[PDB]
Design a protein around this ligand. Structure first.
Ligand SMILES: NC(=O)c1ccc[n+]([C@@H]2O[C@H](COP(=O)([O-])OP(=O)(O)OC[C@H]3O[C@@H](n4cnc5c(N)ncnc54)[C@H](O)[C@@H]3O)[C@@H](O)[C@H]2O)c1
Ligand SMILES: NC(=O)c1ccc[n+]([C@@H]2O[C@H](COP(=O)([O-])OP(=O)(O)OC[C@H]3O[C@@H](n4cnc5c(N)ncnc54)[C@H](O)[C@@H]3O)[C@@H](O)[C@H]2O)c1
Ligand SMILES: NC(=O)c1ccc[n+]([C@@H]2O[C@H](COP(=O)([O-])OP(=O)(O)OC[C@H]3O[C@@H](n4cnc5c(N)ncnc54)[C@H](O)[C@@H]3O)[C@@H](O)[C@H]2O)c1
Ligand SMILES: NC(=O)c1ccc[n+]([C@@H]2O[C@H](COP(=O)([O-])OP(=O)(O)OC[C@H]3O[C@@H](n4cnc5c(N)ncnc54)[C@H](O)[C@@H]3O)[C@@H](O)[C@H]2O)c1
Ligand SMILES: O=C1N[C@](c2ccc(N3CCOCC3)cc2)(c2ccsc2)CC(O)=C1Sc1ccccc1Cl
Ligand SMILES: O=C1N[C@](c2ccc(N3CCOCC3)cc2)(c2ccsc2)CC(O)=C1Sc1ccccc1Cl
Ligand SMILES: O=C1N[C@](c2ccc(N3CCOCC3)cc2)(c2ccsc2)CC(O)=C1Sc1ccccc1Cl
Ligand SMILES: O=C1N[C@](c2ccc(N3CCOCC3)cc2)(c2ccsc2)CC(O)=C1Sc1ccccc1Cl
Lengths: 331, 331, 331, 331
């Protein structure tokens, strides 16, 4: 008999479906950062990786596998075929094209639509009941695309949105006040990136409003220019790109955070992108960031933040701009 | 009159030194993977990063900083100057020259030795009481080099040695037996990499020796060819490099495991490179991997493994060739 | 409208079931030790508690609930009705009578049996696919009683057994060697308690056999008295009861460790009680401790430990004794 | 030679003074609940336990030690003599005299003062640079007592204060709103227990003030009775005592959260008791709960909360109530 048969007596052979499975699509810097963070937080009992670059994908899979002794995820798989993704609770999409210098924005978005036209149908076929978490840029447009192609109810399509913007905002705030970001509460909402909206009325430590103490907070004519905090969120994103060429660790950690709430049904509030139609004067099928409650259902609830006229106006403009692009897309 | 003073009443401005600082030298894929693993394992109250490439260095620092909301390390610093590394409890060196001959007449070993020549004095200056953890290759030679330059006692200079080798070996054992690598015990010792030695007599599940069950284990007449498991360890190392260009996650994870033992004073046993002068008929000043007890003093103790004649000859062989290189090193 | 409706817009109201539910039956010192350990290891998305004493049960439930801010388990329920345990994955039974003054061992066993005649049918009623983890003493006998009444396949009926014995043993061995228990490997098998069996041949550090380099290990002729280590394990069990009146923290950690493997499908090897028929010449329906591979299906596999004649004899005697009591049980 | 010496070669025997040591004084339900929460969160490399009841103290030490296999805190000591507390970074005081029938208010505090007259000078004798975290009731007076006897700067004397109060409050809020307590923000300040003050203005989810949405928040006439949430805090405390006789888990978890911020220098904000003279028109040496930034030097900063005149008045009354006792204390 084999060494295995000499050592180990088998009681059963039967193999269940993985109960807590997560899939990462796209093994670039972002996907891999999401991957390691998820593994280190013991969020999955099985992890699947998918990309089109075959060699890189096997390389990444093996690197992770070799670390198994220090992890609590017993099975890591990868492949070009989506059968390896079957029965996923959570599916994270990080796949995207790289914008070229002679390339339009509409052309870039369409290129990622063409990418999602391949990925999404395959994910739905093998994990019909899964939650979708979209990271690919422009996140808000691609969250819409994913929602449209999948045919999933809105609660199952989650966009990364302003989770990272908020994360960075709270870091900067915390460094300014000499207090840990966990205790610095701040919400950046609306469209992810350059057009995001900081809600100055909500910024507080220990529940005392900074806007109440400082009525000119976040305003153009503010002596201290706390507007700088949001300004520097935007600038630092470009700075990181200029310095190392990509961003990984921070986005990886923020995504792991969302995954944690979903996989463990925590029902914590998170600034994520969702179907925004019906509020702040928006009539179009568009996804934007508002604090949402996250659990095993994805987005079960959303918080109705009280926005000023100028803030509401900014979300309108973003939704108009987003729907203006979306109506010119080929499926 | 300022918002911060309005919000927060200061009791004291007192400068203090961090109580559990860790530094990572070399901000490449290995350095960065060690850093993120360490950060997610909550091992340090401060992380410092050092490299010669300045823009990449600042990029990585900021990316890490931006995830502060999801971590318990309140302070991450970086710089070209070693003042940022002061008062470290543990210093991890993952620095190394570009693997490109023709850039200098000095070979890879010689190039990395020169890199160590101005690194080690700089870290011992700011952290005279730290433990040194050497990862850079050739790890065994460089551990000796770091020991020779630093002037540190033996217990405070640790090489990564065969930690990765064993981690990869246990993963593969676990796969053959359908058991988690944590329950699959097995030790690869000697010189890190190609010339490493698997100790067949130690391999066991639940204290049941595999060699006792199966005497042909690791020989040429094994019908299940278990010798192939160590061969695959070597092969997979080259295959990762072939596929993705570098290794990161596995080595990063194993380094964090050592750091855990050290920072928490656990006294766990790890395959790491230490001076083996006085063991296995070795009389020269060489560092090879043996099972070491790891704690707040570094390597406080080492396990004396009984080896077969063949295994002893392979370590001696390694020791001779290592000493042959080192006796011709000028400082 | 309510403030809740003011604050929160609801997307859907789909009520949901726990995906990782754990139930603890018996809310005493052991029961709570398990609960708190489990809660702090983030193993469950819901914890259920049941006991016959209603006032203590509610008060314990509340106390845990009040720690929710610092926990990751969103739901903690309790009740005397077993409808609170519906769809549990793991069911831990810590319930039992205590030996009265006039009471003899036989009378006490049957009284626990009577308790299981109530609990066991009620458990399977609501969670027919759960794993049964038996903690209550006499654990080996009562594991069998769980097995008989449930009608469960042996793989889903698990006795805590020698897990605490091994835990305590490895602690003492560690204290002797100045090594963390994690790196000190030793297995205590067979009947839990006074009649447990230390497997000297499997005791090792870093894969090096203690028996091999110290052949008198295990015998009276030993000058270093290592039999005392196993004897001290027995002594400590009585001593703790004399000193504080009960055991809680050590058993609660051991159980939670078993819980982690089961819930996360780790396939780690643990010393637990399982149907031993057909091993070591034992013909009776008897549960004894051997190393088992624990996963999502409970005990999938057993490690076949090569015992000596002496050890085999001790196990077979335990089996005869256990059946002598089991044969006379009315249930 | 000993088996130990045959197996292990020693590099050095000399041992370092404790680096991350925590002591817990009082080994009742509260002290042990803190002990286990600290251990399971890995906040110390050494834990000391102190009490006057020598038999149960030993029993608890042993029980914790038998769990070392599943813990990452390698050194656990206990003893009646305070030499076992030497070089503690943090000392947690949970020792208290039980409440008697028909017993005077000034009487119970004095009995506890005399307990502190022995404890406090002993702790400073062996850990003169530690931080004191006081848990014993009445927590606000005894924090002051500890401050006066220690001679420590106020920043190093911390009362658990309203930490448990706020934790329970946020659980009840969370239960009402269908959202995890971590996302439900609310502060109860002032005097711990019966006379605590709920700060209705700082109550929010995602920066959205509940007071602003619902101006009746906190008033007797509120149709939704949101004030009952605070009343339910007080009532649950008496209920738990009634149902089980004591309260352990919740207090343990909260205390350990405070320990985390101190040990890892997090600079998070917690509602704890500090010397409040100079604030809110208070003119006496009184300790009251207020948001404080907690780090390696204890309280370095506090948040200046804007209070309504009703809240301010209640705080001033507590101060006067507390000072009346303190000024009539013999120590
Ligand atoms: N949402 C955010 O806050 C945020 C932050 C940072 C980055 N991002 C976005 O995340 C994406 C990841 O960027 P990187 O990972 O930095 O970029 P990258 O170009 O390194 O990664 C893209 C990966 O997608 C893969 N891919 C392409 N087409 C695919 C397909 N049809 N199926 C599967 N995989 C496919 C590619 O092989 C590549 O590995 C980018 O679009 C970036 O804009 C979003
Ligand atoms: N110990 C192991 O088992 C193991 C495993 C894998 C890799 N390694 C070794 O780790 C090393 C690093 O791996 P990598 O993939 O990050 O390599 P890399 O070339 O990507 O990283 C090397 C880094 O060192 C920096 N550096 C160069 N000179 C420096 C100096 N004088 N001071 C400070 N930093 C300096 C470089 O700027 C670069 O960022 C390699 O030598 C590799 O062989 C060891
Ligand atoms: N196997 C081991 O390693 C190990 C270690 C320690 C303790 N134990 C065993 O664990 C058991 C419990 O110990 P403990 O100190 O928690 O005991 P305990 O006196 O607290 O009793 C446990 C609880 O069982 C409850 N109970 C009784 N009948 C019940 C019923 N019909 N349904 C539900 N609950 C019921 C009681 O109310 C009590 O709260 C003991 O039998 C002890 O021998 C085993
Ligand atoms: N601040 C809070 O939120 C909060 C919450 C709950 C309980 N508590 C307080 O915690 C305290 C302890 O509660 P418990 O349930 O553990 O009570 P307990 O009476 O069971 O424990 C008190 C322990 O203190 C020990 N002790 C007494 N005098 C001592 C001395 N001179 N030196 C050392 N140890 C000594 C006793 O031996 C006893 O074990 C109580 O005063 C309670 O009011 C505070
Ligand atoms: O950190 C970020 N980086 C991105 C980015 C990521 C990867 C790549 N490449 C290009 C080369 O290939 C590698 C990936 C290029 C850009 C960014 C930065 C400035 S504009 C967009 C994407 C993104 O959305 C954020 S967050 C952000 C961005 C702008 C403003 C505010 C925020 Cl919070
Ligand atoms: O995983 C490994 N990879 C290394 C390696 C790491 C980085 C780079 N580059 C090249 C491109 O630039 C980035 C760094 C090149 C090689 C290796 C693999 C085969 S030979 C050496 C270094 C190393 O030591 C191990 S472990 C190992 C190696 C050989 C045999 C056995 C083992 Cl366990
Ligand atoms: O730690 C233990 N304690 C027990 C035990 C636990 C609780 C109670 N009560 C009685 C008072 O009410 C509270 C519960 C009574 C006994 C023990 C101790 C000496 S004999 C059995 C049960 C048990 O099985 C172990 S482990 C053990 C026992 C013997 C030998 C070896 C080992 Cl590892
Ligand atoms: O949870 C608590 N429990 C205590 C308490 C703790 C232990 C004991 N014993 C005495 C009998 O021996 C066993 C321990 C007695 C009382 C309490 C409960 C009602 S009044 C005070 C102490 C305390 O301060 C709080 S918190 C609290 C209290 C009142 C209002 C609001 C809050 Cl948050």
């Amino acid at each position: 008999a084999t060494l295995k048969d000499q050592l180990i007596y088998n009681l059963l052979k039967e193999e269940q479906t993985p109960q807590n499975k997560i899939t990462v699509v796209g093994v670039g810097a972002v996907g891999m950062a999401c991957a390691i963070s998820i593994l280190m937080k013991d969020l999955a009992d099985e992890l699947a990786l998918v990309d089109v670059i075959e060699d890189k994908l096997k390389g990444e899979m093996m690197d992770l596998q070799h670390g198994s002794l220090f992890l609590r995820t017993p099975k890591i798989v990868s492949g070009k075929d989506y059968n390896v993704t079957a029965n996923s609770k959570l599916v994270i999409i990080t796949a995207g094209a790289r914008q070229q210098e002679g390339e339009s924005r509409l052309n870039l978005v369409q290129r990622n639509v063409n990418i999602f036209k391949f990925i999404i149908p395959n994910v739905v076929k093998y994990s019909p009941n899964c939650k979708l978490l979209i990271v690919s840029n422009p996140v808000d447009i691609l969250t819409y695309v994913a929602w449209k192609i999948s045919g999933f109810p809105k609660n199952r399509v989650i966009g990364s949105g302003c989770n990272l913007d908020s994360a960075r905002f709270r870091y900067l705030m915390g460094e300014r006040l000499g207090v840990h970001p966990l205790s610095c509460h701040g919400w950046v909402l609306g469209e992810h990136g350059d057009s995001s909206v900081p809600v100055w009325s909500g910024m507080n430590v220990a529940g005392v409003s900074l806007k109440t103490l400082h009525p000119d907070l976040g305003t153009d004519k503010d002596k201290e220019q706390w507007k700088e905090v949001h300004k520097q969120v935007v600038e630092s994103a470009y700075e990181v790109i200029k310095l190392k060429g990509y961003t990984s660790w921070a986005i990886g950690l923020s995504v792991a955070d969302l995954a944690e709430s979903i996989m463990k049904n925590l029902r914590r509030v998170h600034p994520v992108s969702t179907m925004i139609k019906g509020l702040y004067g928006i009539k179009d099928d568009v996804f934007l960031s508002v604090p949402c409650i996250l659990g095993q259902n994805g987005i079960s609830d959303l918080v109705k933040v009280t926005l000023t006229s100028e803030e509401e106006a900014r979300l309108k403009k973003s939704a108009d701009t987003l729907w203006g692009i979306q109506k010119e897309l080929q499926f």
